[PDB]
Design a binder for this molecule. Structure first.
Ligand SMILES: CCCCCCCCCCCCCCCCCC(=O)OC[C@H](COP(=O)([O-])OCC(O)COP(=O)([O-])OC[C@@H](COC(=O)CCCCCCCCCCCCCCCCC)OC(=O)CCCCCCCCCCCCCCCCC)OC(=O)CCCCCCCCCCCCCCCCC
Ligand code: BCL
Ligand code: BCL
Ligand code: BCL
Ligand code: BCL
Ligand SMILES: CC[C@H]1c2cc3[nH]c4c(c3C)C(=O)[C@H](C(=O)OC)c4c3nc(cc4[nH]c(cc(n2)[C@@H]1C)c(C(C)=O)c4C)[C@@H](C)[C@@H]3CCC(=O)OC/C=C(\C)CCC[C@H](C)CCC[C@H](C)CCCC(C)C
Ligand SMILES: CC[C@H]1c2cc3[nH]c4c(c3C)C(=O)[C@H](C(=O)OC)c4c3nc(cc4[nH]c(cc(n2)[C@@H]1C)c(C(C)=O)c4C)[C@@H](C)[C@@H]3CCC(=O)OC/C=C(\C)CCC[C@H](C)CCC[C@H](C)CCCC(C)C
Ligand SMILES: COC1=C(OC)C(=O)C(C/C=C(\C)CC/C=C(\C)CC/C=C(\C)CC/C=C(\C)CC/C=C(\C)CC/C=C(\C)CC/C=C(\C)CC/C=C(\C)CC/C=C(\C)CCC=C(C)C)=C(C)C1=O
Ligand SMILES: COC(C)(C)C/C=C/C(C)=C/C=C/C(C)=C/C=C/C(C)=C\C=C\C=C(C)\C=C\C=C(/C)CC/C=C(\C)CCC=C(C)C
Ligand SMILES: [Fe+3]
Lengths: 302, 236, 281
């Protein structure tokens, strides 16, 4: 065979890397955790350090709370019997307040009040974690691409359980925390709105989702294909183009008439993906509020 | 209705996005050219983008694209047909002339630097703290080639300090000199390292480096381009 | 015609077939024997689709639809107007796809790079053959394959899935959706990272990969690395598609009941099987 570079033939280790400093408060970075020969076969072997700091704790905490709030309810349902728990694990579920309670925060625990709490934690954990990704960027003088991308995802998440339920009128419209539970919600949403396929944004979203796998599959293989010219070192090839960047571009040019640059391809990459939850967010937001049946709508568009 | 309206908006947006995107990928390689090196007439519907500048770190200067494209090297090739679109045969030794699969770019003749300004790659000996932490250790192994004969022996492993990666294998040849081989181009085995692209006699041809304690972007390209070409050219 | 640095690469050689007969470009496109091959298939199949457009009495894109043979013809042939056309188009479609892959191989050899690309492509082709060839032949009827129409094929999906209830319950369809959702999260980050490093805050120095790895430790505590992340994406991608051909190869063959009922093997497990309370009993 001719080495395919999916795995390293030989690993090499050196001292733990404490990482670049810049305006980072080193008082917050944890300690260089162990190494891992396992991971080191596919990618990096060094585990840690992690920059905790204030905000990180808030989320990490605010996050576990949300997680437990639910685990508890499951037990309540499991009858505290551990065998029941394990068995009906995928079946349990914490649903939101009944339609009656509308958008009030009065519903009692066993009526959606518990869901409201858990949700609260979730809402904090995520948003706080979002600022964290913006600051970690800032402390290193890097662009905020990562924060803006993570935002597109928050968009949809924010629509599925916070915006649409508010435009509808009740906490009923949101998603229930549960494995099989939230799968049915989905199947249902579709049926109730007249088959989501007829929803244009939905068909669009799928398009990008498929695009992401198409693109990453393309980008990934290319780089490994020209890794024999140190292709994976993208940033430098952007600063000073090499054969790796030329052969990479030409392979596509000759195949499909056009191509990209070592800095452009990543621009396609970030947009292809981002649009998936950008377009989807819209489609779900209109469903129920403006449009009621996509089939019917698909008939006249008014 | 909003829906009907939200969608046209979107397409119009999507069109601007693609526009922006395509032009951005035209920052290198453009304007198009004719087989003779002169500006081609048809350049596509997309215009070139306003240039942008990169402030390279370590005061290595700046970079602005799009910019003046110059191969900055002779290309030993010659037409094979009187029309456009046909191959261009190598007038000399493809491997030596560095054309085709043996090509290489005239990149800066400086080494890439880790975020601290130090050389990104160094032979393991000069790397304090580094060692082979898993897999067969090649230092000491005899190198074999396309032709199944002996070409040399590994005498060290050049490594990427910041990314802790094996990138090259320093191989000592018969005349006592060393060369570098791309990690991604050798098959390491219990008792020997195998090299398919090249055959023994071609090993000596591998471009050599100046400093014995570092490689420059230009040298990496000449070394790699060369080895990669052997695949097609080693043939005989 | 050529990119500023293209000439040194346009040397002769690499072809798998025909020597140099077809070794030449046409504009930016490389041709090669297989380039001809695919043209032949691609043209042919398009003609047939147009032919089919007449028998159906319409030239509208959102209506045209070449359906496969009815279940009565099993795996045998069928009249053009009644599934025959689909069978021939499916053939051109597959002929085109293979030629295309083999074409990238020659383009690979000429440029002296690795074959990851064509190789990865083959996974897509595979998913396609599962749906139009492997699953149907295993269910003994061309009728199980999907139709060639913009929305009609969407129907095929909807109906095919609901034929087993909520298809969400297909265990392999669950693993697949995981790689798909992941690949995009991965993709979104890789692009965001590389860019945020090459496009720092206005006026600042172009960051280095060291800043890239730092950023992920300061964030999640681990960084897979520039080579790893490119390995990772390729993997997620192909995996998501592999689990997709799987999930369907089993549906209607080894398992043909409701997908939700498949999950009882779990709940029936002796230990908790009879215990009262909980969701089940
Ligand atoms: C409505 C629903 C609301 C949902 C909200 C979800 C938000 C999702 C946002 C996703 C953003 C990802 C963008 C990636 C990116 O480049 O980020 C970096 C970019 C720069 O970050 P940086 O760290 O400051 O700069 C680093 C370097 O200095 C500079 O680094 P740089 O060069 O890499 O960055 C420059 C970047 C600057 O980034 C931007 O300009 C981003 C603009 C975001 C727009 C949001 C899209 C909303 C979708 C609307 C669709 C209609 C539906 C109704 O330029 C671009 O990326 C160009 C974008 C091309 C847009 C094409 C527009 C075409 C319009 C139609 C024209 C007509 C055509 C004729 C036919 O981030 C932003 O500018 C932030 C955008 C945040 C939007 C908040 C909206 C508030 C609500
Ligand atoms: C995988 C499971 C189902 C399926 C389920 C769905 C679902 C669900 C949806 C689609 C949607 C789409 N599907 Mg499908 N689809 C299937 C199989 C196929 C096959 C095939 C050869 O087997 C093809 C060509 C397509 C093509 C398409 C696109 C028309 C459209 C998605 C845009 C997109 O971004 O795609 C990803 C690809 C890219 C981004 C790359 C660019 C390539 C473009 C899109 C190709 C268009 C080809 C055109 C339709 C064929 C022309 C034939 C001529 C002879 C050339 N599907 C199988 C049978 N498909 C979406 C839609 O909006 O439909 C109306 C949608 O919601
Ligand atoms: C029977 C049901 C319907 C249907 C109903 C729906 C419905 C309803 C919805 C979708 C949506 C989607 N559907 Mg559908 N869909 C159907 C059939 C299909 C078919 C097919 C081949 O048949 C395909 C390809 C798709 C594809 C898709 C996607 C394009 C899209 C979701 C994108 C995404 O990434 O979400 C996943 C990503 C997120 C949820 C992002 C937010 C993540 C948050 C921020 C993170 C929280 C993290 C937590 C706090 C941390 C955990 C980590 C700890 C370490 C543990 N559908 C059928 C016809 N589909 C969604 C959409 O956008 O539609 C327009 C949607 O609402
Ligand atoms: C209501 C119906 C059911 C359902 C029924 C089905 C069914 C039925 C199927 C899927 C399949 C899939 N479903 Mg589903 N699915 C549902 C809900 C969902 C949800 C959700 C969030 O609710 C999600 C994320 C998904 C996700 C998915 C994907 C994992 C998977 C399709 C991708 C694939 O295989 O591509 C593979 C890609 C291909 C087959 C395309 C190959 C392309 C070829 C090689 C080239 C074409 C080139 C073109 C002609 C050239 C154009 C050239 C021009 C010049 C442009 N489903 C609901 C519950 N789903 C499919 C699957 O697993 O298929 C194998 C499938 O059959
Ligand atoms: C977009 C339309 C629907 C939807 C439709 C679907 C469909 C359809 C499917 C899922 C599936 C999943 N969905 Mg969902 N899902 C929605 C919204 C959400 C939200 C949210 C905050 O809004 C969250 C956290 C999730 C989370 C999840 C995961 C639990 C699970 C997918 C694994 C995965 O690859 O994740 C991507 C993310 C990562 C890889 C990173 C984070 C790691 C995650 C949290 C790890 C999950 C581990 C799992 C619980 C372990 C089980 C182990 C047991 C031993 C078996 N969904 C919306 C409402 N979801 C799949 C499944 O298998 O369900 C049972 C599936 O088929
Ligand atoms: C195009 C949009 C795509 C996208 C993008 C995206 N996601 C993102 C980002 C981006 C750009 C981030 O920057 C952010 C990130 O930080 O990534 C690493 C993130 C992220 N996307 C996530 C999830 C996610 N993304 C999804 C999807 C998508 N993300 C889309 C495909 C999905 C799906 C498919 O449903 C999920 C589940 C998060 C992992 C992460 C944001 C993290 C966050 O908000 O965290 C709050 C903190 C907690 C909830 C902490 C508690 C966690 C556990 C419940 C407890 C157990 C952990 C504990 C450490 C165990 C200790 C054990 C002891 C024994 C030691
Ligand atoms: C398997 C992993 C993923 C993947 C990878 C992948 N795709 C690839 C590659 C790779 C590695 C390529 O190298 C190749 C490429 O060159 O891309 C630019 C390609 C490619 N992936 C494509 C599409 C594609 N990939 C998809 C998916 C995926 N591709 C996966 C997510 C999908 C989906 C999600 O549906 C589509 C539509 C093509 C654009 C392109 C290959 C182009 C090609 O082979 O072109 C020549 C062929 C023709 C012109 C054929 C026409 C044939 C017939 C005569 C007529 C049409 C018949 C068909 C049955 C009609 C269907 C109609 C529909 C309405 C149902
Ligand atoms: C290392 O970095 C990288 C690059 O840059 C160095 C790159 O460029 C690319 C790839 C480039 C991109 C620009 C990504 C863009 C995003 C996409 C989503 C692309 C996919 C979408 C398409 C619409 C592709 C269009 C497809 C085709 C096939 C167009 C060609 C049209 C035809 C009709 C086919 C011609 C047919 C034949 C048979 C040719 C032979 C000719 C005869 C006459 C016979 C990647 C992945 C990369 O990772
Ligand atoms: C072994 O047991 C222990 C207890 C130790 C731990 C076990 C825990 C377990 C087993 C936890 C299981 C949890 C699971 C499986 C959760 C699954 C969730 C899923 C599948 C999907 C989630 C969908 C949710 C989305 C749509 C939620 C969006 C939420 C928001 C946008 C925020 C909501 C906002 C509210 C209520 C407003 C609050 C008010 C203010 C200030 C704005
Ligand atoms: Fe990359």
């Amino acid at each position: 065979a001719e080495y395919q570079n999916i795995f390293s033939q030989v690993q090499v280790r050196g001292p733990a890397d404490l990482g670049m400093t810049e305006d980072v408060n080193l008082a917050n970075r944890s300690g260089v955790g162990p190494f891992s020969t396992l991971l080191g076969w596919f990618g990096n072997a060094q585990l840690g350090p992690i920059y905790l700091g204030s905000l990180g704790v808030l989320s990490l905490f605010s996050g576990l709370m949300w997680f437990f709030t639910i685990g508890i309810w499951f037990w309540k349902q499991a009858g505290w019997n551990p065998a029941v728990f394990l068995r009906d694990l995928f079946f349990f579920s914490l649903e939101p307040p009944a339609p009656e309670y509308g958008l009030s925060f009065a519903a009692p625990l066993k009526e959606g009040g518990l869901w409201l709490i858990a949700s609260f934690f979730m809402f904090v954990a995520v948003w706080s974690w979002w600022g964290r990704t913006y600051l970690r960027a800032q402390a290193l003088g890097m662009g905020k691409h990562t924060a803006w991308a993570f935002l597109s995802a928050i968009w949809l998440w924010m629509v599925l359980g916070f915006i649409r339920p508010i435009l509808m009128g009740s906490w009923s419209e949101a998603v229930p925390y549960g494995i099989f539970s939230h799968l049915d919600w989905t199947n249902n949403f579709s049926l109730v709105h007249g088959n989501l396929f007829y929803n244009p944004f939905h068909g669009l979203s799928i398009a990008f989702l498929y695009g992401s796998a198409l693109l990453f599959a393309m980008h990934g293989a290319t780089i490994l294909a020209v890794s024999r010219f140190g292709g994976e070192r993208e940033l430098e090839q952007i600063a000073d183009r090499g054969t790796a960047a030329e052969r990479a571009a030409l392979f596509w040019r000759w195949t499909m008439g056009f191509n990209a640059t070592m800095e452009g391809i990543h621009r396609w990459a970030i947009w292809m993906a981002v649009l998936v939850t950008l377009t989807g967010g819209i489609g779900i937001l209109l469903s129920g509020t403006v449009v009621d049946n996509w089939y019917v709508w698909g008939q006249n568009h008014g | 209705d909003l829906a009907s309206l939200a969608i046209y908006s979107f397409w119009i947006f999507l069109a601007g996005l693609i526009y922006y995107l395509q032009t951005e990928n035209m920052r290198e390689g453009y304007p198009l050219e004719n087989e003779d090196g002169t500006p081609a007439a048809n350049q596509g519907p997309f215009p070139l983008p306003k240039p942008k500048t990169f402030i390279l770190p370590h005061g290595r200067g700046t970079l602005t694209v799009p910019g003046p494209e110059s191969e900055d090297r002779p290309i030993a090739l010659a037409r094979t047909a009187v029309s456009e679109g046909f191959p261009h045969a190598p007038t000399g030794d493809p491997m030596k002339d560095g054309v085709g699969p043996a090509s290489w770019v005239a990149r800066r003749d400086l080494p890439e630097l880790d975020g601290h300004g130090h050389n990104k790659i160094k032979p393991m000996k000069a790397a304090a703290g580094f060692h082979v932490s898993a897999g067969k250790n090649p230092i000491g192994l005899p190198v074999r080639g396309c032709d199944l004969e002996i070409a040399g022996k590994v005498v060290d492993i050049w490594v990427d300090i910041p990314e802790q990666m094996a990138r090259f294998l320093e191989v000592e040849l018969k005349d006592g000199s060393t060369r570098l081989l791309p990690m991604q181009m050798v098959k390491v085995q219990s008792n020997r390292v195998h090299v398919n692209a090249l055959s023994s006699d071609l090993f000596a041809g591998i471009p050599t480096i100046k400093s014995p304690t570092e490689v420059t972007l230009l040298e990496e390209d000449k070394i790699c381009g060369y080895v990669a070409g052997g695949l097609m050219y080693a043939a005989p | 015609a050529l990119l500023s640095f293209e000439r040194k690469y346009r040397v002769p050689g690499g072809t798998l077939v025909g020597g140099n007969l077809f070794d030449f470009w046409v504009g930016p496109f490389y041709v090669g024997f297989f380039g001809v091959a695919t043209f032949f298939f691609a043209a042919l199949g398009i003609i047939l689709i147009a032919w089919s457009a007449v028998l159906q009495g319409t030239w509208n894109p959102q209506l045209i639809s070449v359906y496969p043979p009815a279940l009565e013809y099993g795996l045998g042939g069928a009249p053009l107007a009644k599934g025959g056309l689909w069978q021939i188009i499916t053939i051109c479609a597959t002929g085109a796809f293979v030629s295309w892959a083999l074409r990238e191989v020659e383009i690979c050899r000429k440029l002296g790079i690795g074959y990851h690309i064509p190789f990865a492509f083959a996974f897509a082709i595979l998913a396609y053959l599962t749906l139009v060839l492997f699953r149907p032949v295993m269910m003994g009827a061309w009728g199980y394959a999907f139709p060639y129409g913009i929305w009609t094929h969407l129907d095929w999906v909807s109906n095919t899935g609901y034929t087993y209830g909520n298809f969400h319950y297909n265990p392999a369809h669950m693993i697949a959706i995981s790689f798909f959702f992941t690949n995009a999260l991965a993709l979104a980050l890789h692009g965001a990272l590389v860019l945020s490093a090459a496009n720092p805050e206005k006026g600042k120095e172009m960051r280095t990969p060291d800043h890239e790895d730092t950023f992920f430790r300061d964030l999640v505590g681990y960084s897979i690395g520039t080579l790893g992340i490119h390995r990772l994406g390729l993997l997620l991608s192909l995996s998501a598609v592999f689990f997709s051909a799987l999930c369907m190869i089993i549906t209607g063959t080894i398992w043909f009941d409701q997908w939700v009922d498949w999950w009882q093997w779990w709940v029936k497990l002796p230990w908790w099987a009879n215990i009262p309370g909980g969701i089940n009993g």
